[PDB]
Amino acid sequence: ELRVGLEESELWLRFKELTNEMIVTKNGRRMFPVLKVNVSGLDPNAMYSFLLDFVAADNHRWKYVNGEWVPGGKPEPQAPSCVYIHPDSPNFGAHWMKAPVSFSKVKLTNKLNGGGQIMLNSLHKYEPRIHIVRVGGPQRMITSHCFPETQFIAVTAYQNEEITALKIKYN
Ligand SMILES: NC(=O)N1CCN(C(=O)c2ccco2)CC1
């Protein structure tokens, strides 16, 4: 059975208990913490490509009001995010299972841009999600996995200083 686990869940949970925030810039900003995934149960000899996207966790705009994040009352349908392909894609199952799959090079932006960067809407809440896509073989297959521990609100600057302190303490 294909097993997908979050590496460093301990640390993600400290960010999540504060409400996590991720900076977005026009040029694109790398994530801290980095999403790292433990994968087992792939066919070592099969070909797989790891895809990352961001699900809009709700349809609301969030605001930091007197020390607390609060959702607006005017939901809108959220256009789904673009997909980031892990640099090692495509690769053998053995490659992916020999160490945690680390999405250290994804950049989050607020502007439609050349390539690489993933555009998110500022002040929306996102849940990272991966797709493991068996490629090249006869039978294409996709396995998807959500990481609730890694939820964050996309921000142009940190609102909660407790997040700012944690980001620095652990980077
Ligand atoms: N350099 C490229 O044009 N890419 C082509 C698509 N790649 C994939 O591994 C993949 C599998 C499923 C969807 O994409 C990554 C490399």
UniProtKB/Swiss-Prot annotation:
The record's subcellular locations are: Nucleus
Q: What is this protein called?
A: T-box transcription factor T
**GO-annotated cellular components:** chromatin; nucleoplasm; nucleus
Query: Which illness does the annotation name?
Result: Neural tube defects: Congenital malformations of the central nervous system and adjacent structures related to defective neural tube closure during the first trimester of pregnancy. Failure of neural tube closure can occur at any level of the embryonic axis. Common NTD forms include anencephaly, myelomeningocele and spina bifida, which result from the failure of fusion in the cranial and spinal region of the neural tube. NTDs have a multifactorial etiology encompassing both genetic and environmental components.
The lineage, from the top, is: Eukaryota, Metazoa, Chordata, Craniata, Vertebrata
Ranges of the DNA-binding region feature? 11-171
From the UniProt record, give one GO term of the biological process aspect: positive regulation of transcription by RNA polymerase II
Q: In which tissues is it expressed?
A: Detected in testis, but not in other, normal tissues. Detected in lung tumors (at protein level).
Q: What does this protein do?
A: Involved in the transcriptional regulation of genes required for mesoderm formation and differentiation. Binds to a palindromic T site 5'-TTCACACCTAGGTGTGAA-3' DNA sequence and activates gene transcription when bound to such a site.
Covered range within the whole protein? 41 to 211 of 435
Q: Could you tell me the superkingdom of the organism this chain comes from? A: Eukaryota
**Alphabetized UniProt keyword annotations:** Activator, Developmental protein, Disease variant, DNA-binding, Nucleus, Transcription, Transcription regulation
Q: What GO molecular function terms would the record report?
A: DNA-binding transcription factor activity; DNA-binding transcription factor activity, RNA polymerase II-specific; RNA polymerase II cis-regulatory region sequence-specific DNA binding; RNA polymerase II-specific DNA-binding transcription factor binding; sequence-specific double-stranded DNA binding; transcription corepressor activity
- Tell me, how does this one assemble? Monomer.
